[PDB]
Amino acid sequence: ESADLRALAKHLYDSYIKSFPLTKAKARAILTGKTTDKSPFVIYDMNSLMMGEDKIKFKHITPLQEQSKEVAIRIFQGCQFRSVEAVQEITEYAKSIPGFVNLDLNDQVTLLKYGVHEIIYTMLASLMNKDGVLISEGQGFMTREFLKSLRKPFGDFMEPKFEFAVKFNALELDDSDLAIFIAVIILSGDRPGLLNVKPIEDIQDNLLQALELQLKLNHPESSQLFAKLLQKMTDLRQIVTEHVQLLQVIKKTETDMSLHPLLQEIYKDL
């Protein structure tokens, strides 16, 4: 049984490389300054943001800068745009996981709907230092302090993401580990409204074995790593909860904020 589980881990890691353009390996290389490439443009303040504002990939009728008078809104829009693309990359990876295609589509939609936010925050940690986050596919770096400067409620918007990333990065997971971990999160059988729970948990049980084999082999000296990682899964639930509350406060609080239809689908009835 050991040989079949190892093949699954390989399958997932290959799909992961195919699906996700900026990997942890690449992100860490950039963050550690070990790269042929020139260092990212650092946005730490309003002036740096203005010069680097053009670098941000916001695609719309008007340029990012003209989009709002208020800078926290423009950053918010950039995050939402990246999230829409992130959901596409996750969905593509979800289709790669064995048996996911066979399940009921409505189940497949339910799993993505709850899964995506938790996966995004996992992979965001790959982009994160204690001091900031790589943005725009590595081309820029926005500091944690600058994100924390923005007026309320936006100032506290990214901070739990940073707090989670410090703890999660301390696990020192590599890309191969993450591929399986992510697969496990997608295949959670306790999502509200799932029609057929049994096939889901069946796959998730298989994924969980591959994961702990992966972690023993890849991280032999790390005692109870599997345990620590499962506990994180529960932490992610709690980040998303926090995040949704904040969106509602924005919803009623800000008239200007506009939500993409894809996000809007995931957010409704959550």
Binding site: T91, K95, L105, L112, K113, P261, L262, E265, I266
Partner: peptide
């Protein structure tokens, strides 16, 4: 029409 469903039935 779910947009997620549309993404799922994509190639």
């Amino acid at each position: 029409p779910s947009l997620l469903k549309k993404l799922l039935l994509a190639p």
